[PDB]
Design a protein around this ligand. Structure first.
Ligand code: MG
Ligand code: MG
Ligand code: MG
Ligand code: MG
Ligand code: MG
Ligand code: MG
Lengths: 233, 198, 204, 250, 196, 243, 222, 244, 244
C-alpha cells in the first residue's frame, strides 16, 4: 500500500490520491498557528511565533509582499521565502509594466499555478508551507488561504498551523460580529488575537510570542512585532 | 616596431631584442625583456601588439611548462615551435587574433644542434640560420647574407649581432634603446650582461 | 591584404609517357622581403603528390591536414590512397570551408598504382576541380606558367624530356615574377621510382 | 518531460554477460533463415519470404536491401530493427564516404559503419540493442568480393558462406560440405537454393524466396549511357522467374 | 511586374502580366505570377521572384495542414498567414502580394499586403511597378458588383495600359476567375490587348 | 531485471512485452474494419458504435482524412488514435512541401511505422496502442492499403481487416480472393465496391447493419472521402435487394 | 559559361559549353557542365564552378536516398524543390544558376533555378554569360513539336552562339538527351569545333639544357 | 519515475570495488588469450582466436591485432566491437599529436589517453564500461620498445611479457618461468606460441586459430617495421617452433 | 507479476494504463459539473461545496473562459484543471495570432485532447486528475465537449461529471429524450440549475453554491458570460421548486 505509491509526486494512488502532496500538507499541521480575518475595510494577520529554546528568536511568520499585500506562513520557512519572493516579483511586474496594483485574487491564481508545477513534475517536491494572504485593493479587503496542493481560497477569515481548528471554529461563529468591524483597526486586531487564543495550550501569548499584520483602506501593509503588540493581549 | 633578431651559429642560438617600450609620445621603459623561456633549452622572443605580446608568450610558456611536467621530459625545439605555429594559425581565424610574431631559439639536446624558427602572427613558420621580424630584417638580412658563416663560434656570432645592431642604430628612425642578448646552447640559456659595451 | 600574394610561389605539374612531373619554386617572403630560400611546396602522401601555392600558413596547415587524413585513411582502408581519390578528398576538404577558404591553389600529381595511368589536377581555393590531360599551373606566376606551358608542351614526352620542359616552363615563368623564384625543385614521377632534382636559377 | 533515460540499459552481469545482448541474439535465433554463400566471381544472399498472410502482398517487402550499387544486405531477426538499420546504412554510405571521396564505401568499411551503429545501442543511454543479425555482401575494386555477418553486439566477421536464424546450425553444416574455393556464382546460387530448401517448411518458389546476388557489372541497370567509368551496379535482385528457372533444376 | 485582383458579383478575378526581368533583360516573358495557395485562394505575386515563391510555397503548406486539421480556410486566414510571414520578416523580403479567394458565405475577397507587411482588404487592388500608371484609370473605371464579362474587361484594359507604359511589364495577360462555378484560367495575347 | 515488462527492453526469450501489451490495447474499442481494393478505388469500412445517447454521433470516428489523397482508419483507443492522425497529417504536409509531390500511401505508412519502431527501442517512449490502415489510389501504384502496428511492422494488402474478429473477416475475404483469382474487387464504381465491402462484413460477422452502425471511407484518383449516413444507406438499400 | 535546355515532343535535351574561367584566363578548356542528379535527371550549371558541382552532388545524394527510401524513381520537381530551397536558404551566396531537366514517371520536365532560389519552367531556356546569344537563337528557331533530332540541333546551335559571340564561353558542346522511354544519353563533346592547330615548331629542348644542382631519389612506400 | 530502471553503473561496492569494472574484467577472462612479449630488438603480440569454423575466412580477418599507427599496435581481449570504438579514437589522438607537434606520439601518451577514457566510464556518466583489455606494443625515441596493458578500470602498467584474456594466471606463470631479460625476437615468438599452446582450451594450436605480430627495428634500415603475420606465415613459424 | 501501476506510461498485460485509471478516481471524488448543449449555445453549471460559512459567497469562481467564446468547467483536482485551461488559453492565442479567427471549438478541443494524451506517454509526468466539460459557439454552431484523463473526448448533447455524475446524466438523458427539438438557452440555464441541485443529493451533507455560465448566439452574442443577478435567482428558484 502507501509505501509503494508515496515515492513521488508523479504517482497517483489507487484511490486517486497524491501522497507526496499529502505529506507536504502535514508539515503545515506541524507548524505554528496563524489566523487571518477581514472586515470590509481591513484584513489582519495574527500569528503565534515559535521559538526553539528560551535562548533564541521566534521565527518570523509574516512577510510583506507589496504595500498592499502580505502573508503569514505555516510550515517550511524556506518554501515561504521562495513563494513570497515570487509574489513579490509578480506584484512588482504589475506595477512596473501596467502601473497597476496586483489583484489579491490574481495573486492567488498565480500562487496556485506555481505550486501545481511541483505536484505533477518528476524529482520536484511540493512546497511544504501554507500561507494566509491578506490585501487591500480596488475591490476592498481580502484574505486568501494557500495550500501546497495548489488550492487557494478566499475567506472572511481562517487559521492554519497546529491546533488551527480552535480559531477556525471561533471565527466561524464570530463572523457576523467581525465582518462589521469597519473603520476600527484595533478592534479587528483584538478579534484576531482572541481567535488566535483559541488554538493555544502551551503558554499565554506574549511579547516575543505574537505577530500581527494589518492592511486596509488607508493603512499600508504594516508589521507589528513585540514591543508594539503589547496593547493587544 | 621593436627589434627581434636571432642568429643560429654552430653550437648556439643568439636572440637579440630591443629594450624599449614606447606608447604614443613617450618611452615608458628602457629595459624590457621581450623574451620568455619555454623550457630550459628553448627561448622565444616576441614582438607585436601591446597586450597580445606578453599574453601570448606567457600562455605558450604555461603550456610548455605543463607538458614538461606531465611527461618529465623536454620537447624538442622543433616540437615547441610547431605547437606555437598551431596556436597562431588557429588564432588568425579567431575573433581577435593574437597579433604577435615570434622567434624561437632552442638547443636540441637529442640532435645536439641549435635551432631557430621564425613564425609570424599568421602561423607562417620557417627554420633559419638567422632571422628577424619587423623592419630590422630589412637591413640585417643583407648584412648577414654577407658576413654570416655556418661554422661561427658563439663569440663570432655575438660580434656579427653587434654589426647588426650598429647598422640598425645608424639607419632606423626609432631609438629602440639597445637590445638584450641571450644565448641558447647545450648548457641552457644565459643572458649576455655585457653587450651595451663589449 | 590579398592573401594569395603575400608570400609568393608557384607550382606546375605535367603528364608524360607513363610519368608525371611536378615542380615548384623555393621562395617564401613577406611582400618585398625575401625571407626563406628553403620553402618547398610539394608534398606527398605515399605515391600521391600535392603541391600547394598561396598563403604559406595555409599551405602548411593543409599539408598537415592531408597527412592526417591520408594516414587514417590508410589504417581504415589498408592501402595507400589513390590520386583520383585524394583529389576528391582535397576538393571536399576545400569546399568544407566555402565561406572562409584557405587561400591556396593545390595541385595533385601521381600515377595510379592499379592502372598506371599518369594523373594530375588543380583546384581553386574553394574546390572547383580541374582535371587536365596536359598540365596544371598555380601561383603568383600563373599567367606566365600558362604561357610557357601552352607553348612548350607536347603530348607523351619521356621522363628525361618532360623534365626539361617542366623545368624551362617553371624557370622562365618565375623570372618574370617578383614574388617567385629563389630556387626550384622538380619531381619526375614513375611507377617504380621518383626523382627529385634541384635547379640552378637566378637568385634575384 | 524529456528522455531522462540517460543511463545504459545494457549492463554487466556478475558472470560477465551482457544480458540484453544475449537476449537480442535469442530474438535472432527465432527469426527466419537467411544465408550467404560467396563464389569466386560473385556472392549470393538469400532468405525466405515468410508471408504473414495470403492476403498480404509478398512483393511489397524487401528483406534483401541494396545499400550501395555494389553491396547488399539480408537479415534474420526483428524486421523493423533492420529496416531502420538499412536507412541509416544507406545514409552513412554517403555522409561518411561518397560525400567525401566521391566513390562508394568498400564493404568492410560500410560494414564497419553499420557495426558501429549497433554497438552504440549496446552502450548508449536509454536504448535496447538491435534484434537483428545481418549478412552484407558486396564488392569493391580493391578487395574483390566479400560476405560479412554483423551481430547485435556489433561484432562482425568475414565468411566463405554462412547462415543465420532458425535453421542456422543445420545449414551451416550443409554449406561446409558443398562449398569450395572454385565455385562459379550459378553453382553457389544453386547451393544457396538447396540449403534454403531444407529450412523452408512449406511452399518453395520464386514467390517465397528472396535471393539476391553481387556479381558482374550490369550496365543495363544504370539508366543512362555515355560515361565510361561507372560500368554499372553489381547488385541484382533475382526475379521470381529467374529463381524458378533454377528451382526446376533441383 | 503588373498585377491586380477585382471582386465582383460572382466572385473575384486575379489578373497579371507575365514578365520577369533582371534589370532590363526579360528573363522570362511567359511567367505565371498568379499562384494557388488553396483550391479557391490564389495570390498575385510582385517583387523578388525568390522571395515570393518562397513565401507562397510556405503559405500553401500552412494552409494544407490547416485543411487537414480544421477544414477549409477562409481567404482572410490565407491573408493572415501571408501577413505574418511578410511582417515578421520585413527586413529580408521584397514582396508585395495580393491575396484573393472565393467562398460561399463571403463571395469574393481581396487583401493586399504591401511591403511593410500591413494587410488591407479592398474591393479590388493593384500592385507591381506598372501599377502607378493606372491608379487614375482604375479609380475611374471601377464599379462594384460588375459581371464576369465586365470585370474581365476592366482588368484587361487596366493591365493593358500598365503594360503600355511600364517597361517592367509585358508578355501576355493572365487572369484567374474564382466563383462558385469553380476556377477558370484566362489568357490574352499582345496582338489583342495592345490595340484596345 | 524483472522490470523488462515495463519498458521496451528485451525479455530472456527475446521479446518486448510492452510491445505485446500495446497490441492488446488496440482491441479495447471493439470495432472491426476492413479495406478492399476496387479497379481504381479503395474502400474501408469500420463499424461505428455509439452507446451513449448523450453523445453527438457525428463526432465519433476512427476514420481520418490525412491528405487530399490519403485516408486512414485506426483500430485502437481514441486518444492514441488522434495522436497518430495529427502526426500523419503533419508528415504528409511536410513531405509535399519538401519534395514537391503528394506523399504516397506506402511512404506515409513506412514513415509511421518507423516512428513506431522507435518507441520499441527507446525506453522513454511508450508504443501507441493502435493499428493504422492507410488507403488511397496512388498515382503510381494503383489502389493501396498499407497497415502498420505497434511493433513497427507495415505491409501492403490485397485487402485486410482488423479488430477482435480480424480472423473471421480475414478468412471470409481470403476465400473470396481464392475464388476470383485477381487482387481486387472487379468493379467499376466505388459505390459497388462499398457494397461488396459491407456485404462481406455482414456475411462474415453474421450481422445486419443500420446506417448509424457503419463508417465508410473511399479513395479515388485524387481524392479520399467519408460517406454520409445517407450515402451509406443508399448502399444498405442496394444490398437489401440483392441478399 | 553558356547552358540551355530545350523540351521536345517526347522529352527534353540540354547542352552547355566547356569553358571555365578565373577572370580573363581560361582555367579549363574542357570542363563538364552537365551533372547527373539521378539516372534520368540532369542539370546544366553556370555561375561559381564549385557551387554548381557542390549543390548538384548534395541534392543528387539526397535524391538517391529518397529513391531508395520510397522505392520510386526520382522526380524533377523534387530535385527542383530541394535545389530551390537550399539556394534560397543561402540568400544567393551559393552562386548556382541551373537548368534542371529529365524524365520521370510523370513525364518530361524543364525548369531553371537562379542562385537566390527562384524557379522557372519553359520549353526552352538558357542561362550564363552566353544566355543572350543562345536565347537569341532559341527565339529565332524554336517551334513546338520538335523531334529529338531537331531539339539536339537547336540546343547545339544555341551553345554555338555562345561559344562564338561570348568571351565567357568556348571550346566544345556537351548534350544530354533525356527521352521518355529510353535510357538518358549523355553526349560528352558532341561537338568539338575549337581544335588547336598544329604548332609551327617543337620546343623539345635538347637534354642537358637545364642546370641541376643536386639529384636524389624519393622514398614512396612505408 | 525514470530512476526506477537505473543500474547505477558507477558505484562502489561496500568493499570499495567498482561492480561493473569487476564484472567487465570477468567478461574479459572468457575471451581469447592475447600475449605480448618484449625483446631487445622487437616485441611480439600473439593472439588466440575465439569463435571458429571451417567456413570462417581467416585470410581477410583481423579480430585481435590492430595497428594504432606505424609504430604502435594493440592486441585486444573482450568485445571486439567495444574495442573498435576505443581503437578508432586512439588512432585519431595519434594523428592529432602528430599534427600538433610534428613528431610521432610517444607510446605511453597514447596509452594514458586511452586509459583515461576508460576511467571516465568508471566515474561519471552512468554507462557501462567497455568490456575490453589491450596490450600495446609500440616503439619510440624515448624508451624504445614498450609493452603496456589497460583494462576496464582504466589502470595501465608496463611489462616485459604479459597476457590478457582467458588463462592469464597460467600463461603468466609460464611466462615468468621461461622469459629472460636478454631474449631475442625469434625466441620470444617461440615462447609466445608455447605459452598459448599450454593455455589453449582447444585441441591443437593451428594457424587458423592464431594471430601473430612483431614490431622489429631492422638493422639495415632504421625505421621500425610493424609486420602483421599472414596466415601462411603463422603456419610456417608454427612449424619452425615444432607445434606443427 | 505486478507493479504495472507504478509508472504512468506502462501498459498492463490487459493493455490498460493504470495511472490514467487512478487519475479518474481523483476525478470521481470531486464536485459535479455539467454542460447542456442547446439550440444555439451551451450552458455550464457546477456544484460548489460550501466547506464553511467562512467562505466568502460568490467569490471562489470555478468556471473559466478561454478566449472570449469558450467556457471550461472541470471536476477533480482543481489546479490540474487550471493547468489545462492556461494551456487552453495559450493554444487559442497561438491559433488566433496565425489565423485571425478565434479558435473553432472542435479545434480547441483536439488541442486540449492532444495535451492530455501527451500526459500519458511518459513516466516523468502524471496524467491529469480532472475531466473537463467545455465548449462554446463558433463559425458554425454550438459545441459541448468532455475530456477524460486518458485524453479521450467526444461531442455531447449534454454532459456531466463528478460525484453526482449518474443522477445528472439521468436527468440529462431525460432532457434529450423529452426535448428532441433542442432547448432554449433560457430553459437550459434552469434545467442546468435543476440537474445540479438534484446531483447535489449524491452529496446531500454540505450546503452548496450554484454556478452557471452560458454562451449563446442570441442571448450573449456568442460570447461566454456568467449568469448573474436576476437571471441567476430565476433558476435557483425553478430549482428549489422542482426538488419536491
Ligand atoms: Mg594566380
Ligand atoms: Mg621571379
Ligand atoms: Mg511594356
Ligand atoms: Mg519504449
Ligand atoms: Mg517509460
Ligand atoms: Mg465517460
Amino acid at each position: 500500500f502507501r509505501n509503494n505509491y508515496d515515492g513521488d509526486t508523479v504517482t497517483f494512488s489507487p484511490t486517486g490520491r497524491l501522497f507526496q502532496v499529502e505529506y507536504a500538507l502535514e508539515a503545515i499541521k506541524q507548524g505554528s498557528v496563524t489566523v487571518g480575518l477581514r472586515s470590509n475595510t481591513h484584513a489582519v494577520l495574527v500569528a503565534l511565533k515559535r521559538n526553539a529554546d528560551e535562548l533564541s528568536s521566534y521565527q518570523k511568520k509574516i512577510i510583506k509582499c507589496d504595500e498592499h499585500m502580505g502573508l503569514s506562513l505555516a510550515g517550511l520557512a524556506p518554501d515561504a521565502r521562495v513563494l513570497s519572493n515570487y509574489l513579490r516579483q509578480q506584484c512588482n511586474y504589475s506595477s512596473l509594466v501596467f502601473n497597476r496594483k496586483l489583484a489579491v485574487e490574481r495573486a492567488g491564481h498565480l500562487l496556485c499555478d506555481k505550486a501545481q508545477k511541483n505536484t505533477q513534475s518528476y524529482g520536484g517536491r511540493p512546497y511544504g508551507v501554507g500561507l494566509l494572504i491578506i490585501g487591500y485593493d480596488k475591490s476592498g479587503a481580502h484574505l486568501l488561504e494557500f495550500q501546497p496542493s495548489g488550492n487557494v481560497t478566499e475567506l472572511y477569515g481562517t487559521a492554519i498551523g497546529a491546533r488551527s481548528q480552535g480559531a477556525k471554529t471561533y471565527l466561524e461563529r464570530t463572523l457576523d460580529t467581525f465582518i462589521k468591524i469597519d473603520g476600527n483597526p484595533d478592534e479587528l486586531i483584538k478579534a484576531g488575537v482572541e481567535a488566535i487564543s483559541q488554538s493555544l495550550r502551551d503558554e499565554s501569548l506574549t511579547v516575543d510570542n505574537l505577530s500581527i499584520a494589518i492592511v486596509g483602506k488607508d493603512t499600508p501593509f504594516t508589521i507589528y512585532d513585540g514591543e508594539a503588540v503589547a496593547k493587544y493581549i | 616596431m621593436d627589434i627581434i633578431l636571432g642568429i643560429r651559429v654552430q653550437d648556439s642560438v643568439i636572440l637579440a631584442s630591443s629594450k624599449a617600450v614606447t606608447r604614443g609620445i613617450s618611452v615608458l621603459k628602457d629595459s624590457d625583456d621581450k623574451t620568455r623561456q619555454l623550457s630550459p633549452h628553448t627561448l622565444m622572443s616576441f614582438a607585436g601588439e601591446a597586450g597580445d605580446t606578453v599574453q601570448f608568450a606567457e600562455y605558450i610558456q604555461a603550456n610548455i611548462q605543463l607538458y614538461s611536467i606531465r611527461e618529465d621530459y623536454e620537447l624538442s625545439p622543433q616540437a615547441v615551435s610547431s605547437f606555437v605555429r598551431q596556436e597562431l594559425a588557429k588564432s588568425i581565424r579567431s575573433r581577435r587574433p593574437y597579433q604577435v610574431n615570434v622567434l624561437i631559439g632552442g638547443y636540441d639536446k637529442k640532435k645536439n644542434k641549435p635551432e631557430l624558427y621564425q613564425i609570424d602572427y599568421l602561423g607562417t613558420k620557417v627554420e633559419l640560420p638567422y632571422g628577424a621580424h619587423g623592419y630590422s630584417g630589412f637591413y640585417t638580412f643583407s648584412l648577414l647574407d654577407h658576413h654570416y658563416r655556418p661554422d661561427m663560434t658563439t663569440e663570432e656570432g655575438l660580434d656579427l649581432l653587434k654589426l647588426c645592431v650598429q647598422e640598425l642604430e645608424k639607419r632606423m628612425p626609432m631609438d629602440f634603446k639597445g637590445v638584450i642578448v641571450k644565448i641558447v646552447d647545450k648548457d641552457g640559456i644565459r643572458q649576455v650582461d655585457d653587450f651595451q659595451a663589449q | 591584404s590579398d592573401p594569395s600574394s603575400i608570400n609568393g610561389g608557384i607550382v606546375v605539374a605535367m603528364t608524360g609517357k607513363d610519368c608525371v612531373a611536378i615542380a615548384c619554386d623555393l621562395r617564401l617572403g613577406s611582400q618585398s622581403l625575401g625571407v626563406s630560400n628553403k620553402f618547398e611546396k610539394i608534398f606527398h602522401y605515399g605515391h600521391v603528390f600535392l603541391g600547394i601555392t598561396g598563403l604559406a600558413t595555409d599551405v602548411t596547415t593543409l599539408n598537415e591536414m592531408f597527412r592526417y587524413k591520408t594516414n587514417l585513411y590508410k589504417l581504415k582502408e589498408e592501402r595507400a590512397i589513390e590520386p583520383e581519390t585524394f583529389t576528391q578528398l582535397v576538393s571536399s576538404s576545400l569546399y568544407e570551408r566555402r565561406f572562409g577558404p584557405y587561400f591556396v591553389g593545390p595541385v595533385v600529381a601521381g600515377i595510379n598504382s592499379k592502372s598506371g595511368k599518369p594523373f594530375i589536377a588543380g583546384f581553386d581555393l574553394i574546390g572547383c576541380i580541374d582535371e587536365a590531360k596536359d598540365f596544371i599551373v598555380s601561383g603568383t606566376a600563373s599567367d606566365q606558367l600558362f604561357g610557357m606551358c601552352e607553348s612548350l608542351y607536347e603530348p607523351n614526352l619521356e621522363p628525361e624530356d618532360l623534365f626539361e620542359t617542366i623545368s624551362q616552363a617553371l624557370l622562365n615563368a618565375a623570372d618574370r615574377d617578383a614574388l617567385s623564384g629563389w630556387g626550384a625543385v622538380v619531381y619526375i614521377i614513375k611507377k617504380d621510382e621518383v626523382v627529385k632534382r634541384y635547379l640552378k636559377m637566378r637568385q634575384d | 518531460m524529456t528522455d531522462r533515460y540517460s543511463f545504459s540499459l545494457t549492463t554487466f552481469s556478475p558472470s560477465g554477460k551482457l544480458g540484453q545482448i544475449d537476449y537480442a541474439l535469442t530474438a535472432v535465433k527465432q527469426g527466419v533463415t537467411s544465408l550467404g554463400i560467396k563464389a569466386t566471381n560473385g556472392v549470393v544472399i538469400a532468405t525466405e519470404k515468410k508471408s504473414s498472410s495470403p492476403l498480404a502482398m509478398s512483393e511489397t517487402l524487401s528483406k534483401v536491401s541494396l545499400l550501395t550499387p555494389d553491396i547488399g544486405a539480408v537479415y534474420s531477426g526483428m524486421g523493423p530493427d533492420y529496416r531502420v538499420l538499412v536507412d541509416k546504412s544507406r545514409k552513412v554510405a554517403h555522409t561518411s564516404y561518397k560525400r567525401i571521396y566521391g566513390e562508394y564505401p568498400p564493404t568492410k568499411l560500410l560494414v564497419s559503419e553499420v557495426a558501429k551503429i549497433m554497438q552504440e545501442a549496446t552502450q548508449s543511454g536509454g536504448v535496447r540493442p538491435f534484434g537483428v543479425s545481418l549478412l552484407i555482401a558486396g564488392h569493391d575494386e580493391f578487395n574483390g568480393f566479400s560476405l560479412y555477418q554483423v551481430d547485435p553486439s556489433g561484432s562482425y566477421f568475414p565468411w566463405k558462406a554462412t547462415a543465420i536464424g532458425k535453421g542456422s546450425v543445420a545449414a551451416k553444416t550443409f554449406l561446409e560440405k558443398r562449398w569450395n574455393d572454385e565455385l562459379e556464382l550459378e553453382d553457389a546460387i544453386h547451393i544457396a537454393l538447396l540449403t534454403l530448401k531444407e529450412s523452408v517448411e512449406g511452399e518453395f518458389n520464386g514467390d517465397t524466396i528472396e535471393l539476391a546476388i553481387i556479381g558482374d557489372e550490369n550496365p543495363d541497370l544504370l539508366g543512362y549511357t555515355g560515361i565510361p567509368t561507372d560500368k554499372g551496379p553489381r547488385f541484382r535482385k533475382l526475379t521470381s522467374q529467374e529463381i524458378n528457372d533454377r528451382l526446376e533444376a533441383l | 511586374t503588373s498585377i491586380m485582383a477585382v471582386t465582383f458579383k460572382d466572385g473575384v478575378i486575379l489578373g497579371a502580366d507575365s514578365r520577369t526581368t533582371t534589370g532590363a533583360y526579360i528573363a522570362n516573358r511567359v511567367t505565371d505570377k498568379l499562384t494557388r495557395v488553396h483550391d479557391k485562394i490564389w495570390c498575385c505575386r510582385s517583387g523578388s521572384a525568390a522571395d515570393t515563391q518562397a513565401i507562397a510555397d510556405i503559405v500553401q503548406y500552412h494552409l494544407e495542414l490547416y485543411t487537414s486539421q480544421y477544414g477549409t480556410p477562409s481567404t482572410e486566414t490565407a491573408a493572415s498567414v501571408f501577413k505574418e510571414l511578410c511582417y515578421e520578416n520585413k527586413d529580408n523580403l521584397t514582396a508585395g502580394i495580393i491575396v484573393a479567394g472565393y467562398d460561399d458565405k463571403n463571395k469574393g475577397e481581396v487583401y493586399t499586403i504591401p511591403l511593410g507587411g500591413s494587410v488591407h482588404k479592398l474591393p479590388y487592388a493593384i500592385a507591381g511597378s506598372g501599377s502607378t500608371f493606372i491608379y487614375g484609370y482604375c479609380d475611374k473605371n471601377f464599379r462594384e458588383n460588375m459581371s464576369k464579362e465586365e470585370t474581365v474587361d476592366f482588368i484587361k484594359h487596366s493591365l493593358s495600359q500598365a503594360i503600355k507604359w511600364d517597361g517592367s511589364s509585358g508578355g501576355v495577360i493572365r487572369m484567374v476567375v474564382l466563383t462558385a462555378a469553380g476556377v477558370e484560367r484566362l489568357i490574352f495575347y499582345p496582338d489583342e490587348y495592345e490595340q484596345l | 531485471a524483472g522490470y523488462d515488462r515495463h519498458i521496451t527492453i528485451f525479455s530472456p526469450e527475446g521479446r518486448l512485452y510492452q510491445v505485446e501489451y500495446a497490441f492488446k490495447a488496440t482491441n479495447q474499442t471493439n470495432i472491426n474494419s476492413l479495406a478492399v481494393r476496387g479497379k481504381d478505388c479503395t474502400v474501408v469500412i469500420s463499424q461505428k458504435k455509439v452507446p451513449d445517447k448523450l453523445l453527438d454521433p457525428t463526432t465519433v470516428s476512427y476514420i481520418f482524412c490525412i491528405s487530399r489523397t490519403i485516408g486512414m482508419v485506426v483500430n485502437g483507443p481514441i486518444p492514441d488514435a488522434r495522436n497518430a492522425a495529427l502526426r500523419a497529417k503533419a508528415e504528409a504536409a511536410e513531405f509535399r512541401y519538401k519534395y514537391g509531390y503528394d506523399m504516397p500511401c506506402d511512404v506515409l505508412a513506412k514513415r509511421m511505422a518507423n516512428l513506431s519502431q522507435i518507441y520499441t527501442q527507446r525506453a522513454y517512449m511508450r508504443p501507441l496502442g493502435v493499428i493504422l490502415t492507410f488507403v488511397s489510389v496512388d498515382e503510381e501504384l494503383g489502389p493501396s492499403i498499407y497497415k502498420t502496428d505497434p511493433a513497427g511492422y507495415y505491409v501492403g494488402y490485397k485487402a485486410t481487416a482488423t479488430g477482435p474478429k480480424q480472423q473471421e473477416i480475414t478468412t471470409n475475404l481470403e476465400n473470396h480472393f481464392k475464388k476470383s483469382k485477381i487482387d481486387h474487387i472487379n468493379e467499376e464504381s466505388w459505390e459497388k465496391v462499398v457494397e461488396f465491402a459491407i456485404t462481406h462484413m455482414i456475411d462474415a460477422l453474421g450481422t445486419e447493419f443500420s446506417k448509424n452502425d457503419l463508417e465508410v471511407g473511399v479513395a479515388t484518383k485524387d481524392k479520399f472521402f467519408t460517406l454520409s449516413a445517407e450515402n451509406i444507406e443508399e448502399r444498405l438499400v442496394a444490398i437489401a435487394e440483392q441478399d | 559559361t553558356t547552358i540551355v535546355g530545350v523540351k521536345f515532343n517526347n522529352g527534353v535535351v540540354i547542352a552547355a559549353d566547356t569553358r571555365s574561367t578565373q577572370g580573363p584566363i581560361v582555367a579549363d578548356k574542357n570542363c563538364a557542365k552537365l551533372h547527373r542528379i539521378s539516372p534520368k535527371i540532369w542539370c546544366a550549371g553556370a555561375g561559381t564552378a564549385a557551387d554548381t558541382e557542390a549543390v548538384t552532388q548534395l541534392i543528387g545524394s539526397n535524391i538517391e536516398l529518397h529513391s531508395l527510401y520510397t522505392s520510386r524513381e526520382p522526380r524533377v520537381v523534387s530535385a527542383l524543390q530541394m535545389l530551390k530551397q537550399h539556394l534560397f536558404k543561402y540568400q544567393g551566396h551559393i552562386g548556382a544558376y541551373l537548368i534542371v531537366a529529365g524524365v520521370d514517371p510523370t513525364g518530361s520536365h524543364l525548369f531553371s533555378i537562379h542562385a537566390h532560389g527562384s524557379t522557372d519552367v519553359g520549353y526552352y531556356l538558357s542561362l550564363g554569360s552566353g544566355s543572350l546569344a543562345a536565347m537569341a537563337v532559341l527565339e529565332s528557331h524554336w517551334k513546338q513539336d520538335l523531334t529529338k533530332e531537331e531539339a539536339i540541333k537547336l540546343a547545339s546551335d544555341a551553345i554555338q552562339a555562345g561559344i562564338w559571340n561570348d568571351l565567357g564561353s568556348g571550346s566544345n558542346v556537351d548534350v544530354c538527351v533525356m527521352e521518355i522511354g529510353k535510357d538518358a544519353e549523355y553526349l560528352r563533346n558532341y561537338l568539338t569545333p575549337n581544335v588547336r592547330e598544329e604548332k609551327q615548331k617543337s620546343y623539345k629542348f635538347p637534354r642537358g639544357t637545364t642546370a641541376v644542382l643536386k639529384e636524389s631519389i624519393v622514398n614512396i612506400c612505408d | 519515475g525514470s530512476r526506477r530502471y537505473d543500474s547505477r553503473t558507477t558505484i562502489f561496492s561496500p568493499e570499495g570495488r567498482l561492480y561493473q569494472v569487476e564484472y567487465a574484467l570477468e567478461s574479459i577472462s572468457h575471451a581469447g588469450t592475447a600475449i605480448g612479449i618484449m625483446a631487445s630488438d622487437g616485441i611480439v603480440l600473439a593472439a588466440e582466436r575465439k569463435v571458429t569454423s571451417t567456413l570462417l575466412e581467416q585470410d581477410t580477418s583481423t579480430e585481435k591485432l590492430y595497428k594504432l599507427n606505424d609504430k604502435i599496435a594493440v592486441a585486444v581481449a573482450g568485445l571486439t566491437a567495444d574495442a573498435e570504438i576505443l581503437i578508432n579514437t586512439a588512432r585519431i589522438h595519434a594523428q592529432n599529436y602528430l599534427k600538433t607537434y610534428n613528431e610521432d606520439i610517444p607510446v605511453e601518451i597514447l596509452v594514458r589517453r586511452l586509459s583515461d577514457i576508460k576511467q571516465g566510464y568508471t566515474q561519471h556518466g552512468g554507462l557501462r564500461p567497455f568490456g575490453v583489455s589491450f596490450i600495446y606494443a609500440g616503439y619510440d625515441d624515448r624508451y624504445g620498445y614498450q609493452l603496456y596493458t589497460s583494462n576496464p578500470s582504466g589502470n595501465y602498467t608496463g611489462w616485459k611479457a604479459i597476457s590478457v584474456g582467458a588463462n592469464t594466471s597460467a600463461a603468466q606463470t609460464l611466462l615468468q618461468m621461461d622469459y629472460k631479460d636478454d631474449m631475442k625476437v625469434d625466441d620470444a615468438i617461440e615462447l609466445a606460441l608455447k605459452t598459448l599452446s599450454k593455455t589453449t582450451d582447444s585441441s591443437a594450436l593451428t594457424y587458423d586459430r592464431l594471430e601473430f605480430a612483431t614490431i622489429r627495428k631492422g638493422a639495415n634500415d632504421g625505421e621500425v617495421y610493424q609486420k602483421i603475420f599472414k596466415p601462411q606465415e603463422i603456419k610456417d613459424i608454427l612449424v619452425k617452433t615444432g607445434i606443427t | 507479476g505486478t507493479g504495472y501501476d507504478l509508472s504512468n506510461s506502462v501498459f498492463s498485460p490487459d493493455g490498460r494504463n493504470f495511472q490514467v485509471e487512478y487519475a479518474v478516481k481523483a476525478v470521481e471524488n470531486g464536485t459535479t459539473s455539467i454542460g447542456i448543449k442547446c439550440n444555439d449555445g451551451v450552458v455550464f453549471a457546477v456544484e460548489k461545496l460550501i466547506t464553511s460559512k467562512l467562505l466568502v459567497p460568490q467569490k471562489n469562481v470555478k468556471i473559466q473562459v478561454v478566449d472570449r467564446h469558450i467556457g471550461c468547467v472541470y471536476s477533480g483536482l482543481i489546479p490540474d484543471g487550471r493547468h489545462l485551461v492556461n494551456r487552453g488559453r495559450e493554444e487559442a492565442a497561438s491559433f488566433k495570432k496565425l489565423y485571425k479567427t478565434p479558435i473553432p471549438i472542435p479545434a480547441f478541443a483536439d488541442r486540449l485532447g492532444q495535451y492530455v494524451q501527451a500526459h500519458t506517454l511518459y513516466n516523468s509526468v502524471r496524467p491529469f486528475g480532472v475531466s473537463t466539460i467545455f465548449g462554446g459557439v463558433d463559425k458554425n454552431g454550438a459545441h459541448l465537449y468532455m475530456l477524460e484523463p486518458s485524453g479521450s473526448y467526444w461531442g455531447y448533447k449534454g454532459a456531466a461529471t463528478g460525484k453526482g455524475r449518474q443522477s445528472a446524466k439521468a436527468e440529462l438523458e431525460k432532457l434529450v429524450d423529452h426535448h428532441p427539438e433542442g432547448l432554449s438557452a433560457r430553459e437550459a440555464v434552469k434545467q442546468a440549475a435543476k440537474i445540479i441541485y438534484l446531483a447535489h443529493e449524491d452529496n446531500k451533507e454540505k450546503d452548496f453554491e450554484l454556478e452557471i455560465s452560458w454562451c449563446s448566439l442570441s442571448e450573449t452574442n456568442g460570447l461566454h458570460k456568467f449568469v448573474k443577478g436576476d437571471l441567476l435567482q430565476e433558476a435557483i428558484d425553478f430549482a428549489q421548486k422542482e426538488i419536491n
